[PDB]
Coordinates of C-alpha atoms in Angstrom, one line a residue:
Chain A
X1 CA 22.6 -24.1 10.7
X2 CA 19.8 -21.9 12.3
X3 CA 18.7 -18.9 10.2
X4 CA 16.5 -16.5 12.1
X5 CA 14.6 -13.2 11.8
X6 CA 12.2 -10.8 13.4
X7 CA 14.3 -8.3 15.4
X8 CA 12.8 -4.8 15.9
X9 CA 12.1 -1.8 18.2
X10 CA 8.7 -1.1 19.8
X11 CA 6.8 1.0 22.3
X12 CA 6.0 -0.4 25.7
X13 CA 2.8 -2.4 25.1
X14 CA 3.3 -3.3 21.5
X15 CA 4.3 -6.6 19.8
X16 CA 7.1 -8.3 17.9
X17 CA 7.3 -11.7 16.1
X18 CA 10.5 -13.9 15.8
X19 CA 11.0 -16.8 13.4
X20 CA 13.7 -19.4 12.9
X21 CA 14.2 -22.3 10.5
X22 CA 16.7 -25.2 10.2
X23 CA 17.5 -26.9 6.9
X24 CA 19.7 -29.8 7.9
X25 CA 19.8 -33.3 9.3
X26 CA 18.0 -32.6 12.6
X27 CA 15.8 -35.2 14.5
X28 CA 12.0 -35.3 14.0
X29 CA 11.7 -35.5 17.8
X30 CA 14.0 -32.4 18.4
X31 CA 12.9 -29.9 21.0
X32 CA 12.8 -26.2 20.0
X33 CA 12.8 -23.0 22.0
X34 CA 14.1 -19.4 22.5
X35 CA 16.5 -18.1 25.2
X36 CA 17.3 -14.4 26.1
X37 CA 20.3 -12.9 28.0
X38 CA 20.3 -9.1 28.5
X39 CA 22.0 -10.8 33.0
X40 CA 22.2 -14.5 32.2
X41 CA 20.6 -16.8 29.5
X42 CA 17.1 -18.0 30.6
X43 CA 14.6 -20.0 28.5
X44 CA 11.6 -17.8 27.8
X45 CA 9.6 -20.3 25.6
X46 CA 9.9 -23.8 24.3
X47 CA 7.9 -26.3 22.3
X48 CA 8.0 -30.1 21.8
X49 CA 7.3 -31.8 18.4
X50 CA 3.9 -32.8 19.9
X51 CA 3.2 -29.0 20.3
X52 CA 3.3 -29.0 24.1
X53 CA 4.9 -25.8 25.2
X54 CA 6.8 -24.2 28.2
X55 CA 6.8 -20.4 29.2
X56 CA 8.8 -18.4 31.7
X57 CA 6.6 -17.2 34.6
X58 CA 7.3 -13.5 33.6
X59 CA 6.0 -14.0 30.1
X60 CA 3.0 -16.4 30.7
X61 CA -0.1 -15.1 28.8
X62 CA 1.9 -12.4 27.0
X63 CA 4.2 -14.6 24.8
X64 CA 3.2 -17.4 22.4
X65 CA 5.3 -20.1 20.7
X66 CA 4.5 -22.5 17.8
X67 CA 6.5 -24.8 15.4
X68 CA 5.7 -25.8 11.8
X69 CA 7.0 -29.4 11.5
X70 CA 6.7 -29.2 7.7
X71 CA 8.9 -26.2 7.1
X72 CA 11.0 -27.3 10.2
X73 CA 10.8 -23.8 11.8
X74 CA 9.7 -22.2 15.1
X75 CA 8.0 -18.8 15.7
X76 CA 7.8 -16.7 18.9
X77 CA 4.9 -14.2 19.0
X78 CA 5.1 -11.7 21.8
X79 CA 2.6 -9.0 22.9
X80 CA 2.3 -6.3 25.6
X81 CA 6.1 -5.8 25.4
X82 CA 7.5 -4.6 28.8
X83 CA 10.6 -2.4 29.0
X84 CA 12.4 -5.3 31.0
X85 CA 12.0 -7.7 28.0
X86 CA 14.8 -5.9 26.1
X87 CA 17.5 -8.5 25.2
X88 CA 19.1 -10.6 22.5
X89 CA 16.9 -13.7 21.7
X90 CA 18.9 -16.9 20.7
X91 CA 16.9 -19.7 19.0
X92 CA 17.9 -23.2 20.2
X93 CA 17.3 -26.7 18.8
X94 CA 18.1 -29.7 21.0
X95 CA 18.1 -33.5 20.3
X96 CA 18.5 -36.6 22.5
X97 CA 23.5 -39.0 20.4
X98 CA 23.0 -35.5 21.9
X99 CA 22.9 -32.2 19.8
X100 CA 22.4 -28.6 20.8
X101 CA 22.5 -25.9 18.1
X102 CA 22.4 -22.1 18.8
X103 CA 21.3 -19.2 16.6
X104 CA 23.5 -16.1 15.9
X105 CA 21.2 -13.8 17.9
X106 CA 18.2 -11.5 17.1
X107 CA 18.2 -8.2 19.1
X108 CA 14.9 -6.6 20.1
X109 CA 14.5 -3.4 22.1
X110 CA 11.7 -1.7 24.1
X111 CA 11.3 2.0 25.0
Chain B
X1 CA 26.2 -21.2 35.0
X2 CA 26.0 -25.0 35.1
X3 CA 28.4 -27.7 33.6
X4 CA 25.6 -29.7 31.9
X5 CA 22.4 -28.8 30.0
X6 CA 20.6 -32.2 30.0
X7 CA 20.1 -35.1 32.3
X8 CA 18.7 -38.0 30.2
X9 CA 15.9 -36.6 28.1
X10 CA 15.3 -33.6 30.6
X11 CA 16.6 -30.1 29.7
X12 CA 17.6 -28.3 33.0
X13 CA 16.5 -24.7 33.5
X14 CA 17.1 -22.9 36.8
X15 CA 17.7 -23.8 40.5
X16 CA 14.6 -23.5 42.8
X17 CA 16.7 -24.3 45.9
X18 CA 20.5 -24.0 46.0
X19 CA 22.0 -26.7 43.8
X20 CA 19.5 -29.3 45.1
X21 CA 16.2 -28.7 43.3
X22 CA 16.2 -27.9 39.5
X23 CA 13.4 -27.1 37.0
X24 CA 13.3 -29.3 34.0
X25 CA 11.5 -29.9 30.6
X26 CA 11.2 -33.3 29.0
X27 CA 12.7 -32.9 25.5
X28 CA 10.3 -35.4 23.7
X29 CA 7.2 -34.7 25.9
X30 CA 7.7 -30.9 26.5
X31 CA 6.2 -31.3 30.0
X32 CA 7.7 -29.2 32.9
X33 CA 8.9 -31.2 35.9
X34 CA 11.0 -30.6 39.1
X35 CA 14.3 -32.5 39.7
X36 CA 15.7 -33.1 43.2
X37 CA 19.4 -34.1 43.4
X38 CA 20.7 -36.7 45.9
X39 CA 24.1 -38.4 46.3
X40 CA 24.0 -41.9 45.0
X41 CA 25.5 -43.1 48.3
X42 CA 22.4 -42.2 50.3
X43 CA 19.4 -41.7 47.9
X44 CA 17.6 -45.0 48.3
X45 CA 17.9 -44.6 52.1
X46 CA 16.5 -41.0 51.9
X47 CA 13.7 -42.2 49.5
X48 CA 12.8 -45.4 51.4
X49 CA 9.5 -43.9 52.8
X50 CA 8.5 -42.8 49.3
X51 CA 8.3 -46.5 48.3
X52 CA 6.2 -47.7 51.3
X53 CA 2.8 -46.3 50.4
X54 CA 0.5 -46.7 47.3
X55 CA 0.2 -43.6 45.1
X56 CA -2.2 -40.9 46.5
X57 CA -3.5 -37.8 44.8
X58 CA -2.3 -35.6 47.7
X59 CA 1.2 -37.1 48.1
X60 CA 3.9 -36.2 45.6
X61 CA 4.8 -39.2 43.4
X62 CA 8.2 -39.9 41.9
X63 CA 8.0 -39.8 38.1
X64 CA 11.5 -41.0 37.1
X65 CA 14.9 -41.7 38.7
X66 CA 18.1 -41.2 36.7
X67 CA 21.3 -42.5 38.3
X68 CA 24.5 -40.5 37.4
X69 CA 28.1 -41.3 38.5
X70 CA 28.0 -39.1 41.6
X71 CA 24.3 -38.0 41.9
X72 CA 20.8 -39.5 41.6
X73 CA 18.3 -37.2 39.8
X74 CA 14.7 -37.8 41.2
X75 CA 11.9 -36.2 39.1
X76 CA 8.4 -34.9 40.3
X77 CA 5.5 -33.1 38.7
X78 CA 6.0 -29.3 39.5
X79 CA 4.1 -27.3 42.2
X80 CA 2.5 -23.8 42.1
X81 CA 3.1 -22.5 45.7
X82 CA 2.6 -23.6 49.3
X83 CA -0.2 -23.4 51.9
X84 CA 1.8 -21.1 54.2
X85 CA 2.4 -18.5 51.5
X86 CA -1.3 -18.9 50.5
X87 CA -2.7 -18.2 54.0
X88 CA -0.3 -15.2 54.5
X89 CA -1.4 -13.6 51.1
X90 CA -5.1 -14.4 51.6
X91 CA -4.9 -13.4 55.4
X92 CA -7.3 -16.2 56.2
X93 CA -9.3 -18.8 54.2
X94 CA -13.2 -18.9 53.9
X95 CA -14.6 -22.1 55.4
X96 CA -15.8 -23.3 52.0
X97 CA -12.2 -23.1 50.6
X98 CA -10.5 -24.2 53.9
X99 CA -12.7 -27.3 54.0
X100 CA -11.8 -28.4 50.4
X101 CA -8.0 -27.9 51.1
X102 CA -7.9 -29.4 54.6
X103 CA -9.8 -32.5 53.5
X104 CA -6.9 -33.2 51.0
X105 CA -4.3 -32.5 53.7
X106 CA -6.1 -34.9 56.2
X107 CA -6.5 -37.5 53.4
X108 CA -2.8 -37.4 52.7
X109 CA -1.9 -37.9 56.4
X110 CA -4.6 -40.6 56.8
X111 CA -2.9 -42.5 53.9
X112 CA 0.5 -42.2 55.6
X113 CA -0.7 -43.4 59.0
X114 CA -2.8 -46.3 57.7
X115 CA 0.2 -47.3 55.5
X116 CA 2.5 -47.4 58.5
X117 CA 4.3 -44.0 58.4
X118 CA 4.4 -41.0 60.7
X119 CA 5.5 -37.6 59.3
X120 CA 6.9 -36.0 62.5
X121 CA 7.5 -32.6 60.8
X122 CA 4.0 -31.5 59.6
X123 CA 3.6 -27.8 58.7
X124 CA 1.5 -25.7 56.3
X125 CA 4.8 -25.1 54.2
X126 CA 5.0 -28.9 53.7
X127 CA 1.8 -28.8 51.5
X128 CA 2.1 -27.5 48.0
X129 CA -0.4 -26.8 45.1
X130 CA -0.7 -29.2 42.2
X131 CA -2.4 -26.8 39.8
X132 CA -2.1 -23.1 38.8
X133 CA -5.6 -22.4 40.2
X134 CA -4.3 -23.6 43.6
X135 CA -7.3 -25.9 44.3
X136 CA -5.4 -29.2 44.7
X137 CA -2.6 -29.8 47.2
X138 CA 0.0 -32.5 48.0
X139 CA 2.5 -33.4 50.7
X140 CA 5.8 -32.2 49.3
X141 CA 7.7 -35.4 50.1
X142 CA 8.1 -38.3 52.6
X143 CA 11.9 -38.1 52.8
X144 CA 12.0 -37.5 56.6
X145 CA 9.0 -39.7 57.5
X146 CA 9.5 -42.5 60.0
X147 CA 8.7 -46.1 58.9
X148 CA 6.9 -47.9 61.7
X149 CA 8.3 -51.4 62.6
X150 CA 5.0 -53.2 62.9
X151 CA 1.9 -51.7 64.6
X152 CA 3.5 -49.7 67.4
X153 CA 3.8 -45.9 66.6
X154 CA 5.7 -45.0 69.8
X155 CA 8.4 -42.4 69.4
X156 CA 11.1 -41.5 72.0
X157 CA 12.9 -38.5 70.3
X158 CA 11.3 -35.1 70.4
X159 CA 10.5 -33.8 66.8
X160 CA 8.5 -30.9 65.3
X161 CA 8.4 -27.2 64.4
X162 CA 7.7 -25.5 67.7
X163 CA 4.3 -24.1 66.7
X164 CA 3.0 -27.6 65.7
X165 CA 4.5 -29.5 68.7
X166 CA 1.9 -31.3 70.8
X167 CA 1.7 -31.2 74.6
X168 CA 2.6 -34.9 74.8
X169 CA 6.0 -34.3 73.2
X170 CA 7.0 -31.5 75.5
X171 CA 6.2 -33.1 78.9
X172 CA 7.3 -36.6 77.7
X173 CA 8.9 -39.2 80.0
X174 CA 10.0 -41.4 77.1
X175 CA 7.4 -42.8 74.6
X176 CA 4.5 -40.9 72.9
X177 CA 2.2 -41.7 70.0
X178 CA 3.5 -40.3 66.7
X179 CA 0.1 -40.5 65.0
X180 CA -1.6 -38.5 67.7
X181 CA 1.2 -36.0 67.3
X182 CA 0.7 -35.7 63.6
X183 CA -3.1 -35.2 64.3
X184 CA -2.3 -32.4 66.8
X185 CA -0.3 -30.7 64.0
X186 CA -3.3 -31.0 61.6
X187 CA -5.4 -29.1 64.2
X188 CA -2.9 -26.3 64.2
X189 CA -2.9 -26.1 60.4
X190 CA -6.7 -26.0 60.4
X191 CA -6.9 -23.2 63.0
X192 CA -4.2 -21.2 61.2
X193 CA -6.0 -21.5 57.8
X194 CA -9.3 -20.4 59.2
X195 CA -8.1 -17.8 61.7
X196 CA -5.1 -16.4 59.9
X197 CA -2.6 -16.7 62.9
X198 CA -1.2 -19.7 65.0
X199 CA -3.3 -20.9 68.0
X200 CA -0.1 -20.9 70.2
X201 CA 2.4 -18.0 69.8
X202 CA 4.7 -16.0 72.0
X203 CA 8.0 -14.1 72.2
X204 CA 10.2 -17.1 72.9
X205 CA 9.9 -21.0 72.8
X206 CA 9.7 -21.6 76.6
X207 CA 6.7 -19.2 77.0
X208 CA 5.2 -20.8 73.8
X209 CA 5.6 -24.3 75.2
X210 CA 3.8 -23.1 78.5
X211 CA 0.7 -22.1 76.5
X212 CA 0.7 -25.4 74.6
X213 CA 1.1 -27.5 77.9
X214 CA -1.9 -25.6 79.5
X215 CA -4.0 -25.2 76.3
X216 CA -4.0 -21.4 76.2
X217 CA -5.8 -20.7 72.8
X218 CA -9.0 -19.0 71.7
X219 CA -11.2 -19.7 68.7
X220 CA -13.0 -16.7 67.1
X221 CA -16.8 -16.8 67.6
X222 CA -17.2 -16.0 63.8
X223 CA -16.2 -19.6 62.8
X224 CA -19.1 -22.0 62.4
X225 CA -20.2 -24.4 65.2
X226 CA -18.9 -27.4 63.1
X227 CA -15.6 -25.7 62.4
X228 CA -15.1 -25.0 66.1
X229 CA -16.2 -28.5 67.0
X230 CA -13.6 -30.0 64.7
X231 CA -10.8 -27.8 66.0
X232 CA -11.6 -28.9 69.7
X233 CA -11.9 -32.6 68.7
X234 CA -8.2 -32.3 67.8
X235 CA -6.6 -29.5 69.9
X236 CA -8.7 -29.8 73.1
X237 CA -8.3 -33.7 73.5
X238 CA -5.8 -36.0 75.1
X239 CA -4.4 -38.6 72.5
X240 CA -6.9 -41.3 73.6
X241 CA -9.9 -39.0 73.2
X242 CA -8.4 -37.1 70.1
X243 CA -9.6 -37.9 66.6
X244 CA -7.5 -40.0 64.2
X245 CA -6.5 -38.7 60.7
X246 CA -9.0 -41.0 59.1
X247 CA -11.8 -40.1 61.6
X248 CA -11.3 -36.4 60.7
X249 CA -12.6 -37.1 57.2
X250 CA -16.1 -38.2 58.5
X251 CA -16.6 -34.9 60.4
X252 CA -19.9 -33.0 59.6
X253 CA -18.0 -29.8 58.9
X254 CA -16.9 -31.0 55.4
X255 CA -20.5 -31.9 54.6
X256 CA -21.8 -28.3 55.1
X257 CA -23.4 -26.5 52.1
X258 CA -21.5 -23.1 52.4

C-alpha cells in the first residue's frame, strides 16, 4: 500500500524530488529504497531505519535519499539531472517473515 | 533477472563477476557488502586458508557465511578498485604514494608467510582498495593459498603468472622455496608501481623466461637510491641472499621524508 509522488519533466542539469509513504502494518526495521528501469530494474538509492544509505555509482554525489520514521515515508532528492536518468522510478519497502512491497511507478523525464 | 531477491538479511543487487560475485546491502544495517558464491560441497575446502591466519588490516576478512541448500554465500566488505587498474590509470606512482601502498602489500604477505601460508599467485590485480580514496589496500582472498605442513615451504609444482615467476621456479630440478618466490613477486610489483611497466617483458613466454633466468632488467636513474636499493635486494638476489617479506618492512626507503 505504497502511495508515491514527485514525477516531472526537467532540463538537463535541473532537479526533481520524489516522495513515498506507507500507512499499514510494516516493520519498524524495514529497509526502503528506489529502483528505476528505463533496460532492467537497478537500485539507485536505499536507506536503512538507522539512516545509513546506499547509492548507485552513477548517481553518487548527485542524488540524495532520506526517510521520516515518524510519517513512515521516504524521499529521493536528485540534482544535476542527466539525460540518461530518464526512467520510471518504483519505490520499494522490504522486511526480514519476508515482505517486499512495490509502488505503482512515478515517471520522470529529462531533455 | 535472478530467482531470489534476498539471502538472509542481505538484499542482492548486481553481479560483479558472472554468477559468482554479487553486490549486497544488509537490510537492517544498510551497509554495502560483496557476496561470493561457492558450492556447499567444496566451500570449506576452498576457504580453509582463510581460517588459518589472524585477522589483518590488509587481508580481506570474511564477515558472514550463509549456508543454502546448494550454495554457500560468503560475505566480505566491498572494494574500490585494484592496484593494476590504478597503476595503468596513473601511469606510475610517486615514491611517497608507492611506499605507503607497498608497505601494506608487504605486511599482508609477511602475515601470510609468518602464519604458515604461501600465496603462489601474487599479482598487482590481487590487491584491492578498502576505501573510496584508494589509500588502503587488501589481499583479495586466500582461496588458492597453500597451507604449509610444518616449517618446510618447499614446493615442487610450478606456479605463477609469467611476469611474476622467479628464476628458481623456471630452472627447477624439483623443490624450491615458496616464500622466496612470493618475495620475488613483491619485487616485480614494486618495480611496476614505481616505473609503470614490468621489469621483464617480451613478445612470447620463452623469450620472457630467458630475460628472467639471466636477470635482464634495468631500473630508471630517476628513482631514489633507497628505492633502487630495495628493488635489487629482492630482484637481484638468490633466495638465500634475498630479503624476506618481514625484512622488507625494515628497509630505509619507507622511512624517507618525501
